[PDB]
Enzyme design. Structure first.
Site, short mmCIF file in Angstrom:
data_model
loop_
_atom_site.label_atom_id
_atom_site.label_comp_id
_atom_site.label_asym_id
_atom_site.label_seq_id
_atom_site.Cartn_x
_atom_site.Cartn_y
_atom_site.Cartn_z
N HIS C 43 -5.22 -0.74 -2.75
CA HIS C 43 -4.01 -1.46 -3.12
C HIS C 43 -3.85 -1.51 -4.65
CE1 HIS C 43 -6.60 -5.11 -3.61
NE2 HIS C 43 -5.76 -5.22 -4.65
N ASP C 99 -9.06 -0.94 2.67
CA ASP C 99 -8.58 -1.07 1.30
C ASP C 99 -9.59 -0.45 0.35
OD1 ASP C 99 -7.02 -1.74 -0.91
OD2 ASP C 99 -7.44 -3.92 -0.75
N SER C 205 -9.16 -7.85 -8.34
CA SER C 205 -9.17 -7.01 -7.16
C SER C 205 -9.54 -5.57 -7.51
CB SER C 205 -7.86 -7.10 -6.46
OG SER C 205 -6.90 -6.40 -7.23
#
Ligand SMILES: *[C@@H]1O[C@H](CO)[C@@H](O)[C@H](O)[C@H]1NC(C)=O
Ligand code: NA
EC number: 3.4.21.5
Lengths: 35, 65, 259
Positions: C43, C99, C205
């Site tokens: 992502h 992910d 992230s």
């Protein structure tokens, strides 16, 4: 060799493990395994 | 990605009801004063990302051009 | 990192910052797994809701960084990217199944005191280390708090932050959220009134969740920072890509002839 160098020596930090020195909080991680 | 609170009605992919993301085929009706928020079926606009904005020191020009 | 501490110099030498060229800004964390390969979350590269789909021309990675904003000349390496690889079955609907993404560096880097690869887990490692209550470690340059009064600038750290967080039981993870959790995810964090706090937050992230093996004294990346409902909220948990479960795809990509 498409992976490159680094697999054999991975996970060992030059400023810590390589010098037989512990970082300030790794003790905490091991305590979590033990108790 | 971190889902944070919806900041206007019509948004999705943000926290609408309590700490729950309001997902894709849904949109968030913002409660004003004493009203709860509602996540409802409908087309929503993703809450825009916050720019991880800084004061970076300039790196060599070679790493652009 | 919410409720973390300044990392010592050289604490996380596999730490990578993914950086947008124009505007210059931090995009995500990432990790170094060899002289040539960087692991991050899908992502961070591809995310249609934000109209995000980076090409290699858009990005730089920075390695051996301790400061967030400084250019650390005698210490950090900036590299361009040769190729982006996103897990083919990455499902950005329903919160980010699979992910995971690999970035191949345009050039192999020299290792240093500040630059060094992390180990990827194998079967034994996963079996030994992944137990509820065992603590791993998350590091990144992201927000020190979920929200702010005036500006995001106010929650941004000067130096890399670190936090140690315990793996949470699957049932507890599932019970904490209405999002469907898959076998490609795990959650970590303190339960309310455990009396400790901490979490990944915005800008962390794609960064690594690592654990140290007692058996061989080596660090292993068990996780990639993937998603959360807020940061550091009570009764909520950080969710992380299960690296070991996706290792077959990692191996496929790296062992492929072309790269
Ligand atoms: C992502 O990237 C390529 C261009 O680099 C494009 O062909 C593809 O359709 C893009 N869009 C999405 C949503 O994948
Ligand atoms: Na929490």
């Amino acid at each position: 060799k498409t992976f490159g160098a680094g697999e054999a020596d991975c996970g060992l930090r030059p400023l810590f493990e390589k010098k037989q020195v512990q970082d300030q909080t790794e003790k905490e991680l091991f305590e979590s395994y033990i108790e | 990605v971190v889902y944070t609170d919806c900041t206007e009605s019509g948004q999705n992919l943000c926290l609408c009801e309590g700490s729950n993301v309001x997902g894709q085929g849904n949109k968030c009706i913002l409660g004003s004063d004493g009203e709860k928020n509602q996540x409802v079926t409908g087309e929503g606009t993703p809450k825009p990302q916050s720019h991880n904005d800084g004061d970076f020191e300039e790196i060599p020009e070679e790493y652009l051009q | 990192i919410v409720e973390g501490q300044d990392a010592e110099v050289g604490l996380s030498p596999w730490q990578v910052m993914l950086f947008r060229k124009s505007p210059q800004e931090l995009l995500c964390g990432a990790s170094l797994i060899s002289d040539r390969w960087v692991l991050t979350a899908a992502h961070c590269l591809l995310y249609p809701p934000w109209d995000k789909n980076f090409t290699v021309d858009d990005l730089l990675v920075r390695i051996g960084k301790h400061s967030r904003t400084r250019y650390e000349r005698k210490v950090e390496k900036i590299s361009m990217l040769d190729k982006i690889y996103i897990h083919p079955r990455y499902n950005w609907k329903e919160n980010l199944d699979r992910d995971i993404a690999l970035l191949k560096l345009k050039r192999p880097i020299e290792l240093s005191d500040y630059i060094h690869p992390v180990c990827l887990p194998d079967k034994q490692t996963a079996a030994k280390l992944l137990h509820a209550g065992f603590k791993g470690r998350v590091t990144g340059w992201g927000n020190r708090r979920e929200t702010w009064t005036t500006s995001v600038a106010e929650v941004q750290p000067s130096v890399l932050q670190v936090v140690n967080l315990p793996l949470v039981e699957r049932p507890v993870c599932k019970a904490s959220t209405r999002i469907r959790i898959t076998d490609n995810m795990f959650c970590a964090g303190y339960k309310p009134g455990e009396g400790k706090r901490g979490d990944a937050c915005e800008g962390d992230s794609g960064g690594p969740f690592v654990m140290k093996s007692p058996y061989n004294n080596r660090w292993y990346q068990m996780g990639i920072v993937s998603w959360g409902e807020g940061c550091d909220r009570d009764g909520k948990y950080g969710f992380y890509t299960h690296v070991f479960r996706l290792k077959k795809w990692i191996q496929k990509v790296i062992d492929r002839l072309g790269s």
